[PDB]
Ligand binder design. Sequence first.
Ligand SMILES: [Mg+2]
Length: 268
Amino acid sequence: TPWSKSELVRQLRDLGVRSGDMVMPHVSLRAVGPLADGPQTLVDALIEAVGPTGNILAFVSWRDSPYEQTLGHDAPPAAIAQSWPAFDPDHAPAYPGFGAINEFIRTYPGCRRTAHPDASMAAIGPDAAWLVAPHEMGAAYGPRSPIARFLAHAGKILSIGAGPDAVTALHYAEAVARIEGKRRVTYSMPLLREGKRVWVTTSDWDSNGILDEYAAPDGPDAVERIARDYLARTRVAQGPVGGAQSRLIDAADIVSFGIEWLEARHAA
Ligand SMILES: [Mg+2]
């Protein structure tokens, strides 16, 4: 028997989602189980749970981000520059690796989408426009980004069967932590500026390992190691949503914990 919108809303309220909350979900649909009407069921359940004053913020990115193709170059390679589509926020699909639910959030009526092609965020609710803008190249997850405003606005992270590596908000801790040797990357994105395609080159913190020891492809990154420590040490509301084991995390709390975790382990 597939889960119905009404059942998921009950489970979400028991977990601690309240009317008016600001919530950022990380979802594994395989762990939730079958849904009355597919993934849209869970989207409808989330929106009903935060109510007409609440807000949802999602990390959706872009299916065709040319990050790896432009990484480390001072300009896009000519093959890429000539034919790559410009990022069109109204039509560019979400990145499927971060979850199949994100394409449903993105196309929900009234959803606003941030301008950063690789770090694109989508938001639904009365405060959506204030959350999604500005989102400039060179400020993907740090101060001035949608993540910073989420943290200041009492955001909650809702992890529905997702692992500890999935907590995007911890990239804010990497950005602001006073530690030595932080990795940076250079890359290029094709934006749409008043109708025409423009390539912008920028640098930003490496989001695949903020220090060399976290950037190995074999081992865990800093996000995973912080989240695991936090969950072993902290009382966090835990409970099912659908068939998936879920958690509701205070975003400002886990991010503060991560800044201190990084700074305790590395000199300034
Ligand atoms: Mg409000």
